[PDB]
Amino acid sequence: VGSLNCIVAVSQNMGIGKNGDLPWPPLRNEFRYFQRMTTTSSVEGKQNLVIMGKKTWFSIPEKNRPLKGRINLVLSRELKEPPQGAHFLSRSLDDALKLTEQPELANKVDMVWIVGGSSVYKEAMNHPGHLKLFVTRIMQDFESDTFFPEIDLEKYKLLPEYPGVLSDVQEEKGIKYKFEVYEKND
Numbered sequence: 347v348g349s350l351n352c353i354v355a356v357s358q359n360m361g362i363g364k365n366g367d368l369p370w371p372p373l374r375n376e377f378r379y380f381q382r383m384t385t386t387s388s389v390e391g392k393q394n395l396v397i398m399g400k401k402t403w404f405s406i407p408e409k410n411r412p413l414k415g416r417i418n419l420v421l422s423r424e425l426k427e428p429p430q431g432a433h434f435l436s437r438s439l440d441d442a443l444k445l446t447e448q449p450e451l452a453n454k455v456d457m458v459w460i461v462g463g464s465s466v467y468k469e470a471m472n473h474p475g476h477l478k479l480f481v482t483r484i485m486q487d488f489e490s491d492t493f494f495p496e497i498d499l500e501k502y503k504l505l506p507e508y509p510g511v512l513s514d515v516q517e518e519k520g521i522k523y524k525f526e527v528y529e530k531n532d
């Protein structure tokens with residue numbers, strides 16, 4: 347099992363969700379980036395694991411579930427089995443990660459990607475260890491009801507570049523956005 351990573355798109359006021367969808371209109375190329383970064387292994391014949399909360403799961407369009415080419419793991423304590431189309435169900439972030447230590451998983455999984463929502467990001471972000479954050483800055487305010495936790499910049503260093511991550515400002519449907527990678531190791 348290789349790296350642990352969070353990936354998020356976030357508006358200027360720290361918004362990630364509204365009413366079960368994103369705060370902004372769909373940005374195809376942002377989704378495309380998400381799919382590429384989460385899918386691409388750095389160890390062929392191996393797969394990446396995506397970990398998400400229950401609400402995130404159901405906020406993905408059914409035709410994109412499971413996220414293809416990835417092991418899909420959903421967090422819930424109410425569910426008694428993985429949702430239709432998901433693979434794994436876990437009851438805590440520890441359990442999902444500890445689950446990547448099982449013989450079965452250990453030698454099949456490259457990167458672990460936490461792909462939301464707020465509570466799973468907060469726990470991972472505040473846990474000691476090596477963790478990167480792939481953050482897309484959506485460069486305006488959007489009305490939101492779910493927010494990304496504080497990024498402590500004493501811990502998380504914004505990297506000046508990263509392979510496979512376009513650096514400069516993008517725009518789609520009149521909305522400018524920028525790809526960032528942050529790393530801590532504590």
Ligand SMILES: NC(=O)C1=CN([C@@H]2O[C@H](COP(=O)(O)OP(=O)(O)OC[C@H]3O[C@@H](n4cnc5c(N)ncnc54)[C@H](OP(=O)(O)O)[C@@H]3O)[C@@H](O)[C@H]2O)C=CC1
Nearest residue numbers: 354355363366399400401402405421422423424462463464
């Ligand atoms: N902009 C982006 O990058 C992203 C946007 N989104 C959007 O953001 C919002 C996500 O909302 P959010 O409310 O944060 O929800 P989550 O995806 O975190 O779902 C919350 C539910 O997941 C289960 N859950 C969360 N963490 C754990 C845990 N550690 N262990 C066990 N179960 C857990 C609980 O379900 P149970 O009650 O069953 O225990 C909880 O009620 C939606 O609008 C979504 O579309 C989501 C991802 C990324």
